[PDB]
Short mmCIF file of C-alpha atoms in Angstrom, two decimals:
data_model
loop_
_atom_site.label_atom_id
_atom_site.label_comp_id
_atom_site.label_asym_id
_atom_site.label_seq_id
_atom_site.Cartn_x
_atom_site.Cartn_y
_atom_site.Cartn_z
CA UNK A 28 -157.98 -165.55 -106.77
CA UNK A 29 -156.95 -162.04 -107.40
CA UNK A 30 -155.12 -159.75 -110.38
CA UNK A 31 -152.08 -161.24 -109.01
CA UNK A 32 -153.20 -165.06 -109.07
CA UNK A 33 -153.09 -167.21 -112.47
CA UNK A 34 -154.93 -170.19 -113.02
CA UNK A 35 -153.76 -173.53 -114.75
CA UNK A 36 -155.57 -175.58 -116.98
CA UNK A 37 -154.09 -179.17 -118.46
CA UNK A 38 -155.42 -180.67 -121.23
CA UNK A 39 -155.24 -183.26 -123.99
CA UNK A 40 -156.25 -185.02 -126.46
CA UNK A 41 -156.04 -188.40 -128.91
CA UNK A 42 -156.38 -186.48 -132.05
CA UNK A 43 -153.50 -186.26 -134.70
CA UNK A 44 -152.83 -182.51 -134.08
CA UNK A 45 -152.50 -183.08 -129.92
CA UNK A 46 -150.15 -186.77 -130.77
CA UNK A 47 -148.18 -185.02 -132.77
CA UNK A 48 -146.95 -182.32 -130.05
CA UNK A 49 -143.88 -183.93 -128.78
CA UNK A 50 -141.43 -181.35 -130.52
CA UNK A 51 -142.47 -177.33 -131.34
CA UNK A 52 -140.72 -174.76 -132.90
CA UNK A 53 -144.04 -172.31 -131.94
CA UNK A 54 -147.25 -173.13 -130.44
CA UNK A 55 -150.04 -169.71 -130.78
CA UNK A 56 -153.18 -169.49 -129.67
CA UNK A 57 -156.21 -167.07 -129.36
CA UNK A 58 -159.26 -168.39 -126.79
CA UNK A 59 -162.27 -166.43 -125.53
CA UNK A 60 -162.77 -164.52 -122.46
CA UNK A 61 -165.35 -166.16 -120.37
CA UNK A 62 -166.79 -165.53 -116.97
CA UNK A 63 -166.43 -167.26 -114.02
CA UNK A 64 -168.73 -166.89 -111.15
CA UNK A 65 -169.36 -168.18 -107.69
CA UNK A 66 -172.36 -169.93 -106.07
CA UNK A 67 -173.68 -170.07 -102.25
CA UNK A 68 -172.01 -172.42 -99.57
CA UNK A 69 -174.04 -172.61 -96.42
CA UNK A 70 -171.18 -172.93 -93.77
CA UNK A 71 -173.50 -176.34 -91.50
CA UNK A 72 -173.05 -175.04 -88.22
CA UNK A 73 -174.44 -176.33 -85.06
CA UNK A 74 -175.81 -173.37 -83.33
CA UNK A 75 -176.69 -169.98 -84.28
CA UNK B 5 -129.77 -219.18 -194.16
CA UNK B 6 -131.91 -222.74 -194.45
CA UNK B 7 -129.14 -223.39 -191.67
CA UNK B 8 -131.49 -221.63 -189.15
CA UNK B 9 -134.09 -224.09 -189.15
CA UNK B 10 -131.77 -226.58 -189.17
CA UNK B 11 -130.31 -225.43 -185.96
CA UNK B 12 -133.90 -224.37 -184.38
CA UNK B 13 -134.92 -227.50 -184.50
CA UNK B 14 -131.86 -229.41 -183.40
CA UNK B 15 -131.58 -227.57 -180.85
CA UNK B 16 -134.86 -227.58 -179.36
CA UNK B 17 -133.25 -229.50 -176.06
CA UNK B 18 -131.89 -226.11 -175.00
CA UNK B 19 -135.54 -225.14 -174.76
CA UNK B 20 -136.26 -227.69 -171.93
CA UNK B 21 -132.85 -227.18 -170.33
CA UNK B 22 -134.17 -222.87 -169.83
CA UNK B 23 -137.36 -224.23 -168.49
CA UNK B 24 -135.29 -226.37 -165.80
CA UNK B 25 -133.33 -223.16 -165.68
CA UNK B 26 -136.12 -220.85 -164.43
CA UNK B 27 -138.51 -223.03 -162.68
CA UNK B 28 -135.21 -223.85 -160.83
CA UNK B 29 -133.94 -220.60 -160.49
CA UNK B 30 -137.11 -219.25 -159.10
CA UNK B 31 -137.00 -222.18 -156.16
CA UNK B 32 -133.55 -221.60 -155.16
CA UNK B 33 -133.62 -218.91 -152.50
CA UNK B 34 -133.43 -215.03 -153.16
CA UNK B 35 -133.45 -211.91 -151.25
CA UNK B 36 -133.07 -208.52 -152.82
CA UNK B 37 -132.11 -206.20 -149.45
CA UNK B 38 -133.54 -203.20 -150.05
CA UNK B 39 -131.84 -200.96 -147.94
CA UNK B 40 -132.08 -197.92 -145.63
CA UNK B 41 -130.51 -194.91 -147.17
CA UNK B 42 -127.94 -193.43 -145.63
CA UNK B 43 -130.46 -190.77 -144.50
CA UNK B 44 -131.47 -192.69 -141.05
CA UNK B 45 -134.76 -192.87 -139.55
CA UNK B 46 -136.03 -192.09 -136.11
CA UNK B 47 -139.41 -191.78 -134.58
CA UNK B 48 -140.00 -189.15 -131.83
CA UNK B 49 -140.18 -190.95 -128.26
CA UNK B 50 -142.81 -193.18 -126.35
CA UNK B 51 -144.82 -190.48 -125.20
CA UNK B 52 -147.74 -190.84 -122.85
CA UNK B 53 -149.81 -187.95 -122.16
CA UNK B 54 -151.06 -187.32 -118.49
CA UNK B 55 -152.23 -184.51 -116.03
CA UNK B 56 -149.13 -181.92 -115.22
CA UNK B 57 -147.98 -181.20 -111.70
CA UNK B 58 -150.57 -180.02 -109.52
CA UNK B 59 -149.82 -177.73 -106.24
CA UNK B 60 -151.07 -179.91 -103.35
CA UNK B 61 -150.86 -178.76 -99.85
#
């Protein structure tokens, strides 16, 4: 994933405010910036 | 104006024939239809919520 790539997230809820989103005149939101980061694979290879 | 008493009392049968009148009256059958305006109602959809469309491959 790259400058170029975006990345989806789907979500819900059974709250009021979440049921109640079946018509919207405007729908704004502000979130925070977070990091992600990638762990170590060991590629299990049978020689070498 | 004695003749009031006079007819009260005489006339005391009417009093029996208005209690046959309501406790009658109240088991015949009655519906007051409360209406809808003629503003209509309508609720949004059956909505389900679910996961959106993911890109297999």
């Amino acid at each position: 994933i790259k400058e170029n790539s975006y990345v989806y997230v789907d979500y819900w809820d059974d709250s009021k405010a979440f049921r109640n989103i079946v018509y919207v005149r405007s729908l704004a939101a502000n979130l925070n910036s977070v990091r992600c980061t990638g762990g170590s694979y060991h590629f299990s290879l049978p020689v070498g | 104006a004695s003749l009031i008493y006079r007819q009260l009392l005489t006339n005391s049968y009417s009093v029996d024939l208005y209690d046959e009148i309501e406790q009658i009256g109240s088991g015949k059958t009655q519906n007051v239809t409360i209406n809808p305006g003629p503003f209509a109602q309508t609720r949004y959809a059956p909505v389900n919520w679910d996961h959106g469309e993911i890109n297999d491959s």
